[PDB]
Design a protein around this nucleic acid. Structure first.
Ligand SMILES: [Mg+2]
Length: 706
RNA sequence: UACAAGAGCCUUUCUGU
RNA sequence: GAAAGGCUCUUGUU
């Protein structure tokens, strides 16, 4: 076991304006009776699940008198069976025989019943309301099996989801593909009661025309995914109506396999009271030092200059696109437009580029870049025109970031031939950040009280190669804020063993980031806020145990008797929690989604632990997915309001756009550093790969990854 | 490879068949 | 269930 438990909730959030919401969680009436856990062993071990459930029903209907009495038990399909009342077998094991036909053959099955444990729903009710510190996971799987018994028979199971055939609304897609509609069904705990999380979904099947229920797994063209996008395009009201109609049609409250366990489910979505946090003010620079107010999570840079602008004296253009497509007229027009746009933004580009020549292939990247470095003293930036996807991008990134230490920016050919003010403005944001300047900062007086002391913000993420591997290693990236502003971040990366979830060398990189912070700000951080991405809920305990100890070890290696407060937050942006507006007057945009800054820490979240949802971004397509934040550790004793406000404001510090993003800036930066390090390994034994992801000394202290 | 966000194919594969 | 990765597509935007 581990000795680090996640902290409980300090309080509930109060700040922000109240918004009425409806989450796709359905209240569950769980009785206090004890249900009984069994296990079924069937030989051989390669039985189909369909005939497994069929022979389970055959035993129930056949051996009714001997064992099963008058009960209807539930089965997950593979191993374990549950019954609401105890079968008269005690600890005994009974071997029975099942006769079945086959595809021209005959099958004889042997089946055994074994008692396992007595799981209690009273203990679950105690754990759901501040009595037991841990929700009993065995009870959760038992309840999930109970509620997914009949969907596994009426519909066709697909993973954890059930898909039914489309009636009337069938999309032919292409060939024999269809648009079979279904839903993900899961059982989640909450402080108030048990919740049935249900989200609507669709996938291709093979009912076709001259056996139905065959899911598509083969390969086809790109037209099918576009047609399925057009068929399944659902805004927030569309998903809300689909899930509500699905729950009204399914009717769990009339299922006999649910009634024997004495369970009621609510047919309506749970009403949850959210709060829309106000956005921070964005302080720009230049002459006016204009202040931008994010309206619906989006602001602009019109009549605004960078907080610190980098004047570009000498720059180069390396066009790897063909001359006949990307001409000199296009390059000159792009240069003039970029110079005027950057002059508007407080980033003056003085004069024409020193170098502007064409090149071909990734083999020419290193000699051309070496010539650029050795010929033009004081060179600040090389613009790389690329003809779409190419290995030239990976070679350029490897040469500029790890080999030569040259700041480079890649632009597609299509964005040079046809320029837009927004593309050039976003480019200028990238250039200003890549050249050492800061675009904007949070308003220092509009920031939470955490910023009144030296505080570093860390973001971590691990990218793993797909399984069936082991020559390809995993990459762990950690970034750290470098001022009280925080908008500039230093990046540290490591290569580690394949498919490893914890960060093995976290202490070394956190030590490097702390050293860089102490160099840049001349102060050690009194508070370390650690945003960790890509950690599953099962891995929470081992990830916390390894990584909190690694952070403490790094702080000790920095200086004796140096133990700053650490907050460990795990970001999960992939889940099935969907939030909708109860009233139409609070829907935002054509997608009708919740406004940016909507935070939920009630009634759908964890019973006894510091966790919350925050939709910091403004959804413009589909239904917004609010990022989930779980506080695995908190030495600083953050209030809920302060932590949520800080998270939202950190989501407002992303430098690549004038937008509020779904996750805070350090987590996004760690993700980008992991992707960049993956690009650095394209040319590729651990020491050869540890040296490959190591960026140049002139590249280490800048935001190459932006 | 201007950027954000949301979905689908598709890929290993734990499998479930 | 998940690594998120590709492949796109959509909304687009100063
Ligand atoms: Mg990642």
């Amino acid at each position: 076991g581990y000795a680090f438990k996640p902290p409980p909730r300090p309080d509930f959030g109060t700040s922000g304006r109240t918004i009425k919401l409806q989450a796709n969680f359905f209240e569950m009436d769980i009785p206090k009776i004890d249900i009984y856990h069994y296990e079924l062993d069937i030989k051989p071990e390669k039985c189909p699940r369909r005939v497994n459930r069929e022979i389970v029903e055959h035993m129930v209907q056949h051996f009714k008198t001997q064992i099963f009495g008058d009960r209807k038990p539930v089965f997950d399909g593979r191993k374990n069976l549950y019954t609401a009342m105890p079968l008269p077998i005690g600890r005994d094991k009974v071997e029975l025989e099942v006769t079945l036909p086959g595809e021209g053959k005959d099958r004889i099955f042997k089946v055994s019943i074994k008692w396992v444990s007595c799981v209690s729903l009273q203990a679950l009710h105690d754990a759901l309301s501040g009595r037991l510190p841990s929700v009993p996971f065995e009870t959760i799987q038992a309840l999930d099996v109970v509620m997914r018994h009949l969907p596994s028979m009426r519909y066709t199971p697909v993973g954890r989801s059930f898909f039914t055939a489309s009636e009337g609304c069938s999309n032919p897609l292409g060939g024999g593909r269809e648009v079979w509609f279904g839903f993900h069904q899961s059982v989640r705990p909450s402080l108030w009661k048990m919740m049935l999380n249900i989200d609507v979904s669709a996938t291709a099947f093979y009912k076709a025309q001259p056996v139905a229920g065959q899911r598509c797994i083969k390969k086809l063209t790109d037209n099918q995914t576009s047609t399925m996008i057009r068929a399944t395009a659902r805004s927030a009201p569309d998903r809300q109506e689909e899930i509500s109609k699905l729950m009204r049609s399914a009717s769990f409250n009339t299922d006999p396999y649910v009634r024997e366990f004495g369970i009621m489910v609510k047919d309506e979505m749970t009403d949850v009271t959210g709060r829309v946090l106000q956005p921070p003010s964005i302080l720009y620079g230049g002459r006016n030092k204009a202040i931008a107010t994010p309206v619906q999570g989006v602001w602009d840079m019109r009549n605004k200059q960078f907080h610190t602008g980098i004047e570009i004296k000498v720059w180069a253009i390396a066009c790897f696109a063909p001359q006949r497509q990307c001409t000199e007229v296009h390059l000159k027009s792009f240069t003039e437009q970029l110079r005027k746009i950057s002059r508007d933004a407080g980033m003056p580009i003085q004069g024409q580029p020193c170098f502007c020549k064409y090149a071909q292939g990734a083999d020419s990247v290193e000699p051309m870049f070496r010539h650029l470095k050795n010929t033009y003293a004081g060179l600040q930036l090389v613009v790389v025109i690329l003809p779409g996807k190419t290995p030239v991008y990976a070679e350029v990134k490897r040469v500029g970031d790890t080999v030569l230490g040259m700041a480079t920016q890649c632009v597609q050919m299509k964005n040079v031939q046809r320029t837009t003010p927004q593309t050039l403005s976003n480019l200028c944001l990238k250039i200003n950040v890549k050249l050492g300047g800061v675009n904007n900062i949070l308003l220092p007086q509009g920031r939470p009280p955490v910023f009144q002391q030296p505080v570093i913000f860390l973001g971590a993420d691990v990218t793993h190669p797909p399984a069936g591997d082991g020559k390809k290693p995993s990459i762990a990236a950690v970034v750290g804020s470098m001022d009280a502003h925080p908008n500039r971040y230093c990046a540290t990366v490591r290569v580690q063993q394949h498919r490893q979830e914890i960060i093995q060398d976290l202490a070394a990189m956190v030590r490097e980031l702390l050293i860089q912070f102490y160099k840049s700000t001349r102060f050690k951080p009194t508070r370390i806020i650690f945003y960790r991405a890509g950690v599953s809920e099962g891995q929470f305990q081992q990830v916390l145990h390894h990584e909190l100890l690694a952070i403490r070890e790094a702080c000790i290696k920095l200086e004796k008797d140096y133990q700053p407060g650490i907050t460990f937050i795990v970001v999960q942006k992939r889940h099935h929690t969907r939030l909708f507006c109860t009233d139409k007057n609070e829907r935002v945009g054509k997608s009708g989604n919740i406004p940016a800054g909507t935070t939920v820490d009630t009634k759908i979240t964890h019973p006894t632990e510091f966790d919350f949802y925050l939709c910091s971004h403004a959804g413009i397509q589909g239904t917004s997915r609010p990022s989930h934040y779980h506080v695995l550790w908190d030495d600083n004793r953050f209030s809920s309001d302060e932590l949520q406000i800080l998270t939202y404001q950190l989501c407002h510090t992303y430098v690549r756009c004038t937008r509020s993003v779904s996750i805070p800036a350090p987590a996004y930066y760690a993700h980008l550093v992991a992707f960049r390090a993956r690009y650095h390994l394209v040319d590729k034994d651990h020491q050869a790969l540890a040296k490959a992801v190591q960026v140049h000394q002139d590249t280490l202290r800048t935001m190459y990854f932006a």
